[PDB]
């Protein structure tokens, strides 16, 4: 129950439960498959 009118006044947000490290761990242009050779 929100007792207040504005959105800033609500409690903390709830877990992204998004999670996708590939923008950080695999930003390569041509896709690399694990097990296939790195450099062909």
């Amino acid at each position: 129950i929100n007792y207040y009118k504005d959105a800033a006044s609500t409690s903390s947000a709830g877990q992204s439960l998004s999670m996708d490290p590939s923008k950080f761990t695999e930003p390569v242009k041509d896709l690399m498959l694990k097990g296939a050779p790195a450099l062909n």
Binding site: N2, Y3, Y4, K5, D6, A8, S9, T10, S11, S12, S16, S18, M19, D20, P21, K23, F24, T25, P37, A38, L39
Partner: protein
Amino acid sequence: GLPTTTLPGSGQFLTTDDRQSPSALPNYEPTPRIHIPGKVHNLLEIIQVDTLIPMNNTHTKDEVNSYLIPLNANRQNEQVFGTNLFIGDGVFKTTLLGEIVQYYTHWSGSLRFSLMYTGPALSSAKLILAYTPPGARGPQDRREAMLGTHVVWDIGLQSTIVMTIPWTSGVQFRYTDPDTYTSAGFLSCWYQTSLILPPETTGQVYLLSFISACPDFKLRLMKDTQTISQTVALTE
């Protein structure tokens, strides 16, 4: 008027509680969000990116050189480097992994340790990396080392080798601040055959080493880092 009773704890301020508050700026409209590449949602997303370990810690002032593990041509049977696995201290401590682990009290999971070779292309080498699970001493010679988790690495076209320290543990969580009961083992590396340089070439070659966490990893019970402190408030 509805009858109430107040409980113990009334009026306390707990920095970790999460409740509603009146907005000081009623009706204000925040700036629209635009798109920005790079959004982070979990610290677990970022500790999977690998970063360099200053393994060569033996210097006396911080230098680019403590990131370089040297290799000697023609040595046989001998040991390249050694370290315990207290990820919250020692070599690990300044790495991104080490640096985040320090915001939490407990960790569990597998670690990924990789070595990228930088010697001339016409050289060759075979190294053994060994993980020694808790309970034995840091290995003292390859024979001792080779009886635990190990990978023979053959230096080739493919420049890096990724060793995993699989989670070996009785207790399902360990402390990030070094603790005995909770200790994780040792990591050592030895010549399997030996580094060989081509003609017209000389000196030391170096390995770069990285650390990142496997998708396996768990961190819990947040706390304050020993890695930052201060004596007076800063000003502009």
